């Protein structure tokens with residue numbers, strides 16, 4: 001308590017492995033979150049998917065056609081793992097907006113499920129895409145859905161897209177990271193195992209949902225081919241399973257870990273040794289190498305669970321960039337707000353799977369072009385602007401570990417809300433420790 005054992009000298013692995021080797025040899029993996037409006041087909045689509053996967057029954061599916069996550073101490077996010085012969089996947093979902101944030105934060109990319117039936121670019125669709133890119137998601141698959149109620153009309157498909165695409169781009173996306181797939185969650189056409197109808201093939205000639213997913217995965221798996229031992233290990237603690245030798249579950253956001261190697265957890269700053277890396281939907285199956293992107297469970301020696309919590313951060317013992325703070329600077333981008341932001345204006349900071357009250361402490365400067373700090377004086381921050389800002393945490397019960405977005409692009413992002421409205425996104429630029 002007064003001090004946990006802590007080191008900055010790497011222990012070696014019981015059975016050293018060639019990371020680059022192990023990556024190549026290994027199957028690609030992708031995690032994704034399934035967003036979309038309330039009546040867009042999210043669950044019938046999910047059902048259909050699992051069904052083609054022989055994970056859902058033929059009747060389990062007829063019931064759904066009139067839970068699904070459940071079927072496949074504090075829980076932060078739900079995961080469901082699955083596999084094809086080409087790739088491994090991990091559906092991510094929160095249980096229970098704050099819940100969307102959790103899902104989005106741990107997912108590699110998003111599938112945006114859209115109702116094509118007879119377009120109104122609506123409230124919670126836009127919300128989700130806004131959170132998606134605020135939170136670090138670059139890749140999308142827009143599952144253009146419910147094609148039957150438009151008889152697979154290329155005319156309509158292309159019409160909805162011409163509305164949505166520009167929005168997605170404005171909001172912060174790039175057109176080549178967006179993939180557009182026509183499907184029917186109900187007929188299962190284009191999802192996985194039921195092929196596109198010939199009528200449909202004469203205009204849509206790109207891949208189906210599943211293949212598109214596998215494609216994503218491969219794209220990812222390649223970047224991870226570089227991974228060295230000169231690469232930091234980063235790991236979001238996502239759940240702590242009770243002991244009666246602790247079990248820690250989370251997502252690697254960087255590098256790799258093998259049994260024998262060591263890690264420090266923040267903010268507790270304990271240095272534990274990992275002696276088993278459990279993985280798979282079970283999580284009895286074990287590997288000798290977890291790498292970035294993998295959802296896994298570490299079986300830790302020298303761990304003190306009372307002082308570990310969801311949303312904590314583990315890293316290489318020689319990695320010294322995670323910090324806790326009252327104050328830090330946000331490169332802040334602002335949406336449409338009711339009132340402007342002023343020094344002292346409080347809000348809730350959302351960050352990874354944690355949320356936290358805070359207030360603006362300083363308005364430091366507008367951002368004119370590129371990244372330059374405009375000499376224009378700034379007494380208040382209004383809607384649809386960007387500025388460097390100093391934030392202060394209030395009523396802190398426990399330190400939040402922070403990483404700047406230069407250190408890591410994903411972990412370094414935060415979403416700001418006040419009075420129930422998503423008001424701004426931010427990149428952590430600097431930490432005033």
Ligand SMILES: Nc1nc2c(ncn2[C@@H]2O[C@H](COP(=O)(O)OP(=O)(O)O)[C@@H](O)[C@H]2O)c(=O)[nH]1
Pocket residue numbers: 036037038039040041042043044045065066145146147148149183184185186187
């Ligand atoms: N015509 C058609 N209807 C669908 C399709 N997929 C879902 N639906 C229906 O549209 C509504 C969307 O509800 P649901 O599946 O729960 O989507 P969610 O509530 O947004 O997750 C339900 O009545 C679905 O059964 C589809 O591919 N074609």
